[PDB]
């Protein structure tokens, strides 16, 4: 069934004077956001981001909410801590992010567990693959290391990673499995555009595909044009699917010598297409 993973992305952003730190938690199952918490509201609560999470009843949401609110307040604390660690003004805006999660094989066994922190967009501390020892990125991160060593936390966390995490992951998997395996095949077409002189540009489009992962190639008589082929980063169409393109500059009148190749997991087989002049 392939591997799986349950991760949480957390952001704490201070904003002195201008209100309380804005705090946010996002949960992903197999890189699909499924729940989210945003502390910027009169009554903030955890909420389903996948419709299939609505099978969970009020108790589930209450328990998650309360945990998130406790984290938030706790993160508000940490932010102050870090000002001191780093001897910074009380004035500035700062950021703490966290990624932590567990990934399990198709047999439901822990394949890898992790937790990395970042301060102001820079690595701060992480949990080694051994789930027992930390790794501080800078002097300040050792205060926190030597502090989590002395309250023994690499164990308390490994518990969650091997225990709670994997269990719930499995439960979430059961529920949204149908919609998680989702695949959308790219539709491809080639467009033709002018260049100066005797060159033209051929652009191979892939649209409406999901997941994001894709590969497009250009071949001159079947031999990829690795060199100076231009592409855009894969981008959301906004409706749940993605878009990408690759282009190359070819000689005018030589367009039929090139073939575009599209590889996506949704395809019974990769697409092959060419500039079609009407």
């Amino acid at each position: 069934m392939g591997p799986h993973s349950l991760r949480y992305f957390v952001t704490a952003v201070s904003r002195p004077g201008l209100g309380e730190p804005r705090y946010m938690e996002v949960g992903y199952v197999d890189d699909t956001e499924f729940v989210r918490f945003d502390s910027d509201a009169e009554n903030p609560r955890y909420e389903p981001r996948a419709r299939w999470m609505e099978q969970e009843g009020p108790e589930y949401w209450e328990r998650e909410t309360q945990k998130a609110k406790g984290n938030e307040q706790s993160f508000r604390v940490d932010l102050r801590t870090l000002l001191g660690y780093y001897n910074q003004s009380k004035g500035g805006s700062h950021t703490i992010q966290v990624i932590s999660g567990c990934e399990v094989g198709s047999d439901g066994r822990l394949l890898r567990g992790y937790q990395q922190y970042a301060y102001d967009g820079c690595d701060y501390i992480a949990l080694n693959e051994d789930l027992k020892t930390w790794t501080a990125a800078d002097m300040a991160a050792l205060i926190t290391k030597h502090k989590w060593e002395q309250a023994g936390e690499a164990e308390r966390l490994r518990a969650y990673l091997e225990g709670t995490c994997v269990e719930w992951l499995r439960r979430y998997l059961k529920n949204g499995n149908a919609t998680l395996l989702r695949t959308d095949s790219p539709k491809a077409h080639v467009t033709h555009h002018s260049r100066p002189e005797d060159k033209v540009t051929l652009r191979c489009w892939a649209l409406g595909f999901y997941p994001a992962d894709i590969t497009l190639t250009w071949q001159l008589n079947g031999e990829e044009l690795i060199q100076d082929m231009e592409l855009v980063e894969t981008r959301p169409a906004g409706d749940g699917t993605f878009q990408k393109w690759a282009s190359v500059v070819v000689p005018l009148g030589k367009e039929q010598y090139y073939t575009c190749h599209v590889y996506h997991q949704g395809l019974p087989e990769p697409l092959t297409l060419r500039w079609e002049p009407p």
Binding site: F9, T11, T95, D120, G121, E233, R235, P236, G238
Partner: protein, 99 residues
């Protein structure tokens, strides 16, 4: 340190003049997370612009999708403007229907 926002401006569907569509401004690789995004039509700010929730990447950088409905014509120019601490001035990226 700060990361410089990267930007793409592009329609949801292949544009046909006269037909309703959605213009996206996809903004990535920025940090810190505070950012200001406007979409402009013919040099003048578009009022109703929706924005996805923010998220961040395995390298800590945030990303966000802004969008607005529109109906392309041959001559209307659209752009997306992003102000961000990492950049001395707001960066504008024009919509090119071939990209």
């Amino acid at each position: 340190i700060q990361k410089t926002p990267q930007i793409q401006v592009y329609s949801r569907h292949p544009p046909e003049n006269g037909k309703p569509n959605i213009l996206n401004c996809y903004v990535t690789q920025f940090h810190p997370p505070h950012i200001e995004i406007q979409m402009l039509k013919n040099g003048k700010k578009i009022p109703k612009v929706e924005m996805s929730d923010m998220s961040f990447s395995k390298d800590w950088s945030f990303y966000i999708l802004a969008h607005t409905e529109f109906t392309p014509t041959e001559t209307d120019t659209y752009a997306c403007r992003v102000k961000h601490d990492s950049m001395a001035e707001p960066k504008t990226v024009y919509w090119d229907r071939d990209m």
